[PDB]
Amino acid sequence: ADTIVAVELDTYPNTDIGDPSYPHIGIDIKSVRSKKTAKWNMQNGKVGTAHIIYNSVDKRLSAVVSYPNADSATVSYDVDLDNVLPEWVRVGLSASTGLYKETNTILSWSFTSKLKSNSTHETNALHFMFNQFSKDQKDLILQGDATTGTDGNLELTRVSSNGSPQGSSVGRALFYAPVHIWESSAVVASFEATFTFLIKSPDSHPADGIAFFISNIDSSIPSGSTGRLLGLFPDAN
Amino acid sequence: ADTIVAVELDTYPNTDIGDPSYPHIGIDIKSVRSKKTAKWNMQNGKVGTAHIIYNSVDKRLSAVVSYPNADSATVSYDVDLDNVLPEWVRVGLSASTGLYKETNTILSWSFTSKLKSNSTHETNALHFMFNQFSKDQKDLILQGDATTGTDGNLELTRVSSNGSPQGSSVGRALFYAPVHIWESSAVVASFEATFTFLIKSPDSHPADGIAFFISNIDSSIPSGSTGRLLGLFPDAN
Amino acid sequence: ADTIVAVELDTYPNTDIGDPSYPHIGIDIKSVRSKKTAKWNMQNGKVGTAHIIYNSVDKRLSAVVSYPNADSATVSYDVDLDNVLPEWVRVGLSASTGLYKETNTILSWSFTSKLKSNSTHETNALHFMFNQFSKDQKDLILQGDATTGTDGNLELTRVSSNGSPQGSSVGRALFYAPVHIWESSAVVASFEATFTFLIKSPDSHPADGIAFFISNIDSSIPSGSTGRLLGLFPDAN
Amino acid sequence: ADTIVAVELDTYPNTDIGDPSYPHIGIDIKSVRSKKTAKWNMQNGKVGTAHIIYNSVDKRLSAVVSYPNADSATVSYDVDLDNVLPEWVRVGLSASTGLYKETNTILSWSFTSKLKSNSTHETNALHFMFNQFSKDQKDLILQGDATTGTDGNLELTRVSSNGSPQGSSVGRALFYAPVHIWESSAVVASFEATFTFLIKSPDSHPADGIAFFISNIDSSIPSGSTGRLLGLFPDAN
Ligand SMILES: [Ca+2]
Ligand SMILES: [Ca+2]
Ligand SMILES: [Ca+2]
Ligand SMILES: [Ca+2]
Ligand SMILES: [Mn+2]
Ligand SMILES: [Mn+2]
Ligand SMILES: [Mn+2]
Ligand SMILES: [Mn+2]
Ligand SMILES: [Xe]
Ligand SMILES: [Xe]
Ligand SMILES: [Xe]
Ligand SMILES: [Xe]
Ligand SMILES: [Xe]
Ligand SMILES: [Xe]
Ligand SMILES: [Xe]
Ligand SMILES: [Xe]
Ligand SMILES: [Xe]
Ligand SMILES: [Xe]
Ligand SMILES: [Xe]
Ligand SMILES: [Xe]
Ligand SMILES: [Xe]
Ligand SMILES: [Xe]
Ligand SMILES: [Xe]
Ligand SMILES: [Xe]
Ligand SMILES: [Xe]
Ligand SMILES: [Xe]
Ligand SMILES: [Xe]
Ligand SMILES: [Xe]
């Protein structure tokens, strides 16, 4: 199977697989069962922003999620990503719906990684920022139901013409270029990611959520990963 | 054939195909016969830096090349790149040797492109910076004789164990991710590139040069483009 | 008097001092009488974005102004800023009202300057980005009627409690740190600025406009520069 | 007295004030007696690089110092800087000599701070990068013996014509613009700093070291802070 590190914005409490009984943000290291969670006061139909940060010195993966005019939610987990992920990875966004549904609309997404070596000319860096997604967005690998270019957004899961989110949908978008997250002369490696999302559901119980993830470069949507598994994991182990 | 836009650092005067009778920097639009050139006081064995800039408002492709402690050389050409290149491109470095030879060593390479739309959330951007190249540099597509990881550099053309550059060599490196250089809601599109290079030759007459180029995404080394054609063009038309 | 280089968003046609008979964007070099203008379809009450770009190789000051969903306006003028401005400058935003009035609200402002030398460690850079202005914004020098922190914006000219713009108002905001726009070993110097603004007026004839400007470091609002002179110039010469 | 947060590169072991018995890197929170240190294999006459990182989510101030071809040294300390520093600060470099001496030469210095709010237009940022310092470097406040423009470097402490470092010297350089390190709607605040330095001494026992620091905006060199106090503190409490 793939190797996954993810920050999940989990809109549906599956308490049977260890979610808390509320929408939450979580850090997922090789399992959908988050290593750490925090309560998230998800706002149906509002545009939210998630920020994810990490560096190889502190070895702490942290995320903050917020909406305008509201208090944020934050979660952190100590993990050495060099011990979890391969040296080259892809980074992406995933979302899913199941029997419950919601739009999983991404309005912007940015990412920066930096590897600073001990050579005085120190830095290798990659940065991208999408504030509009085009119908044929060649620097993204879209998987599953993900589409780009509808109102200039990235729709990770299926939405009908009329704006209605569909159930049992899964979709991901990965940045085209592999990302180097370790180098042998690196003295500091860091990354940050930000994305803005609009999750709306005609229903009181939206599902299932959106994740920012980092994976093996050849990562693909696991069989049966609609719903609670967020398009990230083959099972709930 | 491919579509090429390039800034050439041409170390060998091929006066039969319109080079001036000295090493020069040139702007090449769909032809090796530069649309504009400037004299370049190339310094054998010294590390030089080239800077290339362009934006869609001014529609002027400009480059400056310099060495420490020396006056720079600059060349500019008015060209609307949106009328030359496709909407998606790859960007890269190329170099070649022929019967005359030189190392075509790249010590660093950075690139930024920005498309700013009329939406208040305006910007799509891509930036990369390499200050060290690793043996398996997965975010570069190496073509021809190009190799990475020898002393942490990108050697565009063949060099033997002993540091000796080889003749009749051609090599390119393209960044892995396609680059979007036009979008329909863009009000300004710009790019800049910088690279540092070390061209050294045991010979009085080094050849052939290094170019930064932008091409169709599927660009490949043209048959017979060693030597004066810089790994960019199939012929000298 | 001060030395001013500015891009003006001129909302009021003063045809007696050479404005065209419509709202326009202009490049002003040491005079309010723009060296170059373009028609601007200013939208009362809508948030617009202005982008300004320049580099020392091309020596062309260009600006683009746009609103969402609308075609942009652009203006360019060939000028060597090193021959106009001192080596150190401040950069800022200015606006004014006169007998006609409008809000001159700045919602965001960013600026980047870069000087790249011929030393392989090439770059001196300054960048700032404001997306919210705080009541006591210590890295801005506010002049005249400019205030910060009202709804997190920079109000360049006086607005009453009720949101009503006041006539005969002038205000500027300059970034606190001087900016180096030339250095003796520089081979390329460039800058870009972006700001977002909301100009609204209860009146059919708003006035007078907003400018991004660059000036001597000690620049101050000229006596009698309310109205058509945009807080930039002492007279209309 | 001022409020100081600093990362020290302490070249001289003053074991009487709690330094370890070797050159070390340290995190100093309101005291010269570092809260955390790590051994540093300082290399006399070689150019080293220090990197400092912090964010308000993790509340961990970390630094890494390295030389080319050598293993790095790193130190971290959990501290909420919002509880130590005022909301606006200046950032700078300090160094000193005492009865023992060394050059305290800064060859480059860069700094980025970011405050990201919960408003979807999230970011306030400041970034500067110096790779050459000019004789009259108007965006730096030089204090004590600090000078700029000698070989394009920042010499924090006194050096004679002949390159000889002088004893009993203290000097600092602060960036001109205040820096906002907290805002009330901020959900993440972060900073990073990097500088490159050349510490050389004709003596076996160089002293005293270089620090990157953050202080009240009006920070000044404390009386009697030559030597072990690094130009940062009035005493060794
Ligand atoms: Ca769930
Ligand atoms: Ca040639
Ligand atoms: Ca006017
Ligand atoms: Ca000490
Ligand atoms: Mn969960
Ligand atoms: Mn040529
Ligand atoms: Mn005008
Ligand atoms: Mn110490
Ligand atoms: Xe992640
Ligand atoms: Xe974060
Ligand atoms: Xe990572
Ligand atoms: Xe990453
Ligand atoms: Xe990383
Ligand atoms: Xe190019
Ligand atoms: Xe350039
Ligand atoms: Xe381009
Ligand atoms: Xe490009
Ligand atoms: Xe471009
Ligand atoms: Xe300007
Ligand atoms: Xe522009
Ligand atoms: Xe400028
Ligand atoms: Xe400028
Ligand atoms: Xe500039
Ligand atoms: Xe610090
Ligand atoms: Xe660090
Ligand atoms: Xe800080
Ligand atoms: Xe800071
Ligand atoms: Xe900070």
In angstroms, the CA B128 to CA B144 distance is 22
Are residues B198 and B163 in contact, defined by beta-carbon separation less than 8 angstroms?
A: no
Contact C118 B68 (CB under 8 A): yes
Are residues B108 and B129 in contact, defined by beta-carbon separation less than 8 angstroms?
A: yes
Which amino acid is present at A214? I
Chain C closest-CA separation from residue B16 CA (Å): 30
Q: Which helix (H) or strand (E) holds D112?
A: strand D105-117
In angstroms, the CA B27 to CA A94 distance is 43
Phi, psi of C17 (to 5 degrees): -110, 30
Q: Which residue of B has its CA nearest to A182?
A: B134
In angstroms, the CA B63 to CA A103 distance is 46
Strand segments, DSSP code E, in chain C are 4-10, 24-29, 36-39, 47-55, 60-66, 73-78, 88-96, 105-117, 123-130, 140-144, 147-150, 153-155, 170-175, 179-180, 186-198, 209-216
In angstroms, the CA D118 to CA D124 distance is 12
In angstroms, the CA A199 to CA A153 distance is 13
Strand segments, DSSP code E, in chain A are 4-10, 24-29, 36-39, 47-55, 60-66, 73-78, 88-96, 105-117, 123-130, 140-144, 147-150, 153-155, 170-175, 179-180, 186-198, 209-216
Which positions ≥6 away from C64 have C-beta within 8 Å?
Answer: B57, B187, B188, C50, C51, C72, C73, C74
In angstroms, the CA C64 to CA C76 distance is 9
Tokens 């920050």 identify what position?
A: A7
Q: Is B16 annotated as a binding residue?
A: no
Q: Kind of pairing, strands D105-117 and C105-117?
A: unpaired
A51 lines ligand 10 (CB under 6 A): yes
Annotated binding-site positions of A for Mn(2+): 8, 10, 19, 24
**Chain centroid, CA B39 distance in Å:** 17
Phi, psi of C82 (to 5 degrees): -70, -15
Q: Name which residue sits closest to atom 1 of ligand 19, judged by CA.
A: C6
**Chain centroid, CA C6 distance in Å:** 6
Tokens 């598994």 identify what position?
A: A229
Q: Is C135 on the interface with A (CB under 8 A)?
A: no
Dihedral over Cα of D4, D5, D8, D13: its sign: positive
Q: Of C29, C23, C30, which is closest to residue C73 (Cα–Cα)?
A: C23
Token readout for A196 is 């803005």
Are residues A73 and A54 in contact, defined by beta-carbon separation less than 8 angstroms?
A: no
On chain B, the residues whose CB falls within 8 A of the CB of D121 are: 120-121
Are residues B67 and B75 in contact, defined by beta-carbon separation less than 8 angstroms?
A: no
Phi, psi of D191 (to 5 degrees): -145, 155
Which positions ≥6 away from B154 have C-beta within 8 Å?
Answer: B93, B105, B106, B107, B109, B130, B133, B137, B140, B146, B147, B148, B173
Q: Of D71, D66, D57, which is closest to residue D188 (Cα–Cα)?
A: D57
Which positions ≥6 away from C230 have C-beta within 8 Å?
Answer: C6, C8, C10, C32, C94, C95, C96, C208, C209, C210, C211
Annotated binding-site positions of A for Ca(2+): 10, 12, 14, 19
Determine the length of chain C.
Answer: 237
A214 lines ligand 11 (CB under 6 A): yes
**Chain centroid, CA B173 distance in Å:** 9
User: How does DSSP classify residue D159?
Assistant: B
D79 lines ligand 26 (CB under 6 A): no
In angstroms, the CA C232 to CA D10 distance is 50
Q: Kind of pairing, strands B123-130 and B140-144?
A: unpaired
User: How does DSSP classify residue A214?
Assistant: E
Three-state DSSP at C66 gives strand
Are residues D51 and A187 in contact, defined by beta-carbon separation less than 8 angstroms?
A: yes
Q: Of B101, B194, B198, which is closest to residue B155 (Cα–Cα)?
A: B198
Chain A closest-CA separation from residue C121 CA (Å): 8
Residue B189 Cα, ligand 16 centroid: separation in angstroms?
8
Are residues C120 and B47 in contact, defined by beta-carbon separation less than 8 angstroms?
A: yes
Dihedral over Cα of A153, A156, A158, A164: its sign: negative
Are residues A167 and A98 in contact, defined by beta-carbon separation less than 8 angstroms?
A: yes
Dihedral over Cα of A132, B116, C212, C179: its sign: positive
Which amino acid is present at B116? K
Token readout for C223 is 């006596």
The 3-state secondary structure of chain B reads CCCEEEEEEECCCCHHHCCCCCCEEEEEECCCCCCEEEECCCCCCCEEEEEEEEECCCCEEEEEEECCCCCCEEEEEECCHHHCCCCEEEEEEEEECCCCCCCCEEEEEEEEEEEEECCCCCEEEEEEEECCCCCCCCCEEEEECCEEEECCEEECCCECCCCCECCCCEEEEEECCCEECCCCCEEEEEEEEEEEEECCCCCCCCCCEEEEEEEECCCCCCCCCCHHHCCCCCCCC
Q: Of D83, D64, D82, which is closest to residue D74 (Cα–Cα)?
A: D64
Provide DSSP, C154-222: EESS-B-TTS-B-SS-EEEEEESS-EE---TTEEEEEEEEEEEEE---SSSS---EEEEEEEETT--PP
For Cα atoms B217, A175, B109, give the angle at the middle one, nearest 5 degrees: 60
Three-state DSSP at D126 gives strand
Q: Which helix (H) or strand (E) holds D148?
A: strand D147-150
Q: Of B168, B169, B177, which is closest to residue B147 (Cα–Cα)?
A: B169
Q: Is B8 annotated as a binding residue?
A: yes
In angstroms, the CA C77 to CA C61 distance is 5
In angstroms, the CA B139 to CA D61 distance is 32
In angstroms, the CA D134 to CA D113 distance is 24
- Furthest C-alpha separation in chain B: 56
- For chains B and C, CB pairs below 8 A equal 74
Structure-solving method: X-ray
On chain D, the residues whose CB falls within 8 A of the CB of B121 are: 120-121
Q: How many CB atoms lie within 10 A of CB A47?
A: 16
Q: Of C186, C156, C1, C171, which is closest to residue C81 (Cα–Cα)?
A: C186
Q: Is B192 on the interface with A (CB under 8 A)?
A: no
Chain B closest-CA separation from residue C197 CA (Å): 10
Q: Which residue of B has its CA nearest to C198?
A: B120
Taking phi over 0 as left and psi of -120 to 50 as alpha, with beta for the rest, C181 belongs to alpha
Are residues D172 and D155 in contact, defined by beta-carbon separation less than 8 angstroms?
A: no
Q: How many CB atoms lie within 10 A of CB B71?
A: 9
Q: Which helix (H) or strand (E) holds D94?
A: strand D88-96
Residue A194 Cα, ligand 1 centroid: separation in angstroms?
21
In angstroms, the CA A190 to CA A116 distance is 9
Which positions ≥6 away from B57 have C-beta within 8 Å?
Answer: B188, C53, C62, C64, C74, C76
In angstroms, the CA D140 to CA D171 distance is 12
Chain B closest-CA separation from residue D117 CA (Å): 15
Which positions ≥6 away from D162 have C-beta within 8 Å?
Answer: none
User: Is the omega angle on the peptide bond into residue A208 within 30 degrees of 0, that is, cis?
Assistant: yes
C188 lines ligand 15 (CB under 6 A): yes
Q: Which residue of B has its CA nearest to C73?
A: B187
Are residues D36 and D77 in contact, defined by beta-carbon separation less than 8 angstroms?
A: yes
Q: Is B188 on the interface with C (CB under 8 A)?
A: yes
Are residues D113 and D129 in contact, defined by beta-carbon separation less than 8 angstroms?
A: no
Report the residue of D91, D139, D192 to disrupt the C interface, i.e. the one with the largest count of C CBs within 10 Å: D139
Dihedral over Cα of C133, C135, C139, C144: its sign: positive
B189 lines ligand 15 (CB under 6 A): no
Are residues A186 and A57 in contact, defined by beta-carbon separation less than 8 angstroms?
A: no
In angstroms, the CA C116 to CA C125 distance is 8
Are residues B133 and A120 in contact, defined by beta-carbon separation less than 8 angstroms?
A: no
Provide DSSP, D179-227: EE---TTEEEEEEEEEEEEE---SSSS---EEEEEEEETT--PPTT-SG
In angstroms, the CA A103 to CA A166 distance is 8
Three-state DSSP at C87 gives coil
First to last CA, chain A: 13
In angstroms, the CA A116 to CA D116 distance is 24
Phi, psi of D82 (to 5 degrees): -70, -15
In angstroms, the CA B85 to CA D34 distance is 57
In Å, what resolution does this model reach? 1.8
Taking the domain B1-237, which CATH number applies?
2.60.120.200
- For chains A and D, CB pairs below 8 A equal 74
Q: Is D66 on the interface with C (CB under 8 A)?
A: no
Which amino acid is present at D125? A
Phi, psi of C227 (to 5 degrees): 70, -130
Chain B closest-CA separation from residue A121 CA (Å): 6
In angstroms, the CA B89 to CA B81 distance is 11
In angstroms, the CA A24 to CA A42 distance is 8
In angstroms, the CA A2 to CA C175 distance is 49
In angstroms, the CA C205 to CA C120 distance is 54
**Chain centroid, CA D190 distance in Å:** 17
Are residues C85 and B104 in contact, defined by beta-carbon separation less than 8 angstroms?
A: no
Q: Of B95, B49, B106, which is closest to residue B72 (Cα–Cα)?
A: B49
Dihedral over Cα of A162, A164, A168, A173: its sign: positive
For Cα atoms C105, C108, C112, give the angle at the middle one, nearest 5 degrees: 130
Phi, psi of A16 (to 5 degrees): -70, -25
Three-state DSSP at A228 gives helix
Are residues C141 and C179 in contact, defined by beta-carbon separation less than 8 angstroms?
A: no
Determine the length of chain B.
Answer: 237
D79 lines ligand 25 (CB under 6 A): no
Which positions ≥6 away from D83 have C-beta within 8 Å?
Answer: none
Token readout for D229 is 């106090």
Q: Is A151 on the interface with B (CB under 8 A)?
A: no
Dihedral over Cα of A131, C150, C12, C16: its sign: negative
- Furthest C-alpha separation in chain C: 56
* Closest listed ligand to the CA of B36: 6
Three-state DSSP at A50 gives strand
In angstroms, the CA D203 to CA C143 distance is 53
Q: Which residue of D has its CA nearest to B121?
A: D121
Are residues B188 and C50 in contact, defined by beta-carbon separation less than 8 angstroms?
A: no
